[PDB]
């Protein structure tokens, strides 16, 4: 009934959101896929596992991701002193510069969707769908 | 702000169910991409061009998935009887069977993570994001 089709509505909302995104990304050379490894590591350096595992894609995307990133310059792979195998993903000035170029991208994107929304009902979903995403990520892993 | 918090939590939600969704429709022997074909293709034959279109995946990815599916007998591409190359692809009885078992694991899986609300807020959220899928959709194509 309805809440079948809350979770179908929200798959297609990100397909199409997705779809939408890589493409405005493009003009910052981003995948949305990439601006989502900017993201992650914006607020600190992260492994490659928990960057596959955190959004659902493979390693060897991930690899090809940060391999990416890394040419040009936004991540660098950092080492511990002795345990050089241990490997952090870490942005660079030069990538936080292009994250928040990205979030910008994002954000009047997402003003653009949201528009027949008002602040309220904007607010309403999201302490709801919230609620949804809490469970789903206790069931799923 | 939240506008932005609303797309990113259906972006967390969506690969958290997909996962789930992988998981659980596992043991029908398909995969949230396979099922996606039944949804399709239950209530009409469809090109395998729409298939690609509509889901937000390569021609490769539908390729295989139909191949696998025509393999398990859930489907069958139909040609023209004048031009053989026009092909649809039309759920089988089967098909449809094996697909109704799939809805049955969607919407328990659903019921469970909208569990925290109501049918009311339920009903709410999904006025106000069917808003949202409907200008993303107006947007990306
Ligand atoms: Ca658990
Ligand atoms: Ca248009």
Same mark, same amino acid.
């Given at each position: 009934?309805?809440?079948?089709?809350? #979770? %179908?509505?929200?798959?297609?909302?990100?397909?199409? #959101?997705? =779809? /939408?995104?890589?493409? &405005?990304?493009?003009?910052?050379?981003?995948?949305?896929?990439?601006?989502?490894?900017?993201?992650?590591?914006?607020?600190?350096?992260?492994? #490659?596992?928990?960057?596959?595992? =955190?959004?659902?894609?493979?390693?060897?995307?991930?690899?090809?991701?940060?391999?990416?990133?890394?040419? #040009?310059?936004?991540?660098? &792979?950092?080492?511990?002193? /002795?345990? =050089?195998?241990?490997?952090?993903?870490?942005?660079? /000035?030069?990538?936080?510069?292009?994250?928040?170029?990205?979030?910008?991208?994002?954000?009047?994107?997402?003003?653009?969707?949201?528009?027949?929304? %008002?602040?309220?009902?904007?607010?309403?979903?999201?302490?709801?769908? %919230?609620?949804?995403?809490? &469970?789903?990520?206790?069931?799923?892993?």
């Amino acid at each position: 009934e309805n809440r079948i089709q809350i #979770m %179908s509505t929200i798959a297609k909302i990100y397909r199409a #959101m997705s =779809r /939408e995104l890589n493409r &405005r990304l493009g003009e910052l050379n981003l995948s949305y896929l990439d601006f989502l490894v900017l993201r992650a590591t914006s607020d600190g350096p992260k492994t #490659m596992a928990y960057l596959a595992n =955190r959004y659902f894609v493979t390693q060897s995307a991930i690899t090809a991701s940060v391999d990416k990133l890394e040419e #040009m310059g936004l991540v660098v &792979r950092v080492r511990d002193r /002795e345990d =050089r195998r241990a490997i952090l993903i870490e942005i660079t /000035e030069k990538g936080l510069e292009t994250f928040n170029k990205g979030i910008e991208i994002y954000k009047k994107l997402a003003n653009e969707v949201t528009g027949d929304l %008002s602040e309220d009902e904007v607010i309403l979903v999201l302490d709801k769908i %919230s609620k949804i995403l809490k &469970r789903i990520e206790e069931i799923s892993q």
